[PDB]
């Protein structure tokens, strides 16, 4: 949108958080949100237990 950057502006996952127990935030970075195109280029595999 004009600024020629893709910019994050909406965060609509939760409305409130009242009873916290754990909080970690990574050391701050700047990853690109740029509109790459063609086919898939990253495989990202995760296991959760």
């Amino acid at each position: 949108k004009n600024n020629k950057s893709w910019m994050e502006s909406e965060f609509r996952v939760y409305s409130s958080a009242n009873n916290c127990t754990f909080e970690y935030v990574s050391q701050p970075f700047l990853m690109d949100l740029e509109g790459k195109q063609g086919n898939f280029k990253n495989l990202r595999e995760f296991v959760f237990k």
Partner: protein, 49 residues
């Protein structure tokens, strides 16, 4: 906790939650700063181990 610039009134007693940390009391029980430290289910020495 122990060094806060103002404490609460007892009728409005605070409740600070603590997690993801290590409990070294060596600047604490080993300091004569308290006119009363008493534990009631542990020896004050055993708090490190």
């Amino acid at each position: 906790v122990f060094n806060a610039t103002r404490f609460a009134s007892v009728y409005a007693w605070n409740r600070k939650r603590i997690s993801n940390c290590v409990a070294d009391y060596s600047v604490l029980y080993n300091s004569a700063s308290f006119s009363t430290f008493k534990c009631y289910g542990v020896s004050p020495t055993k708090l490190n181990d």
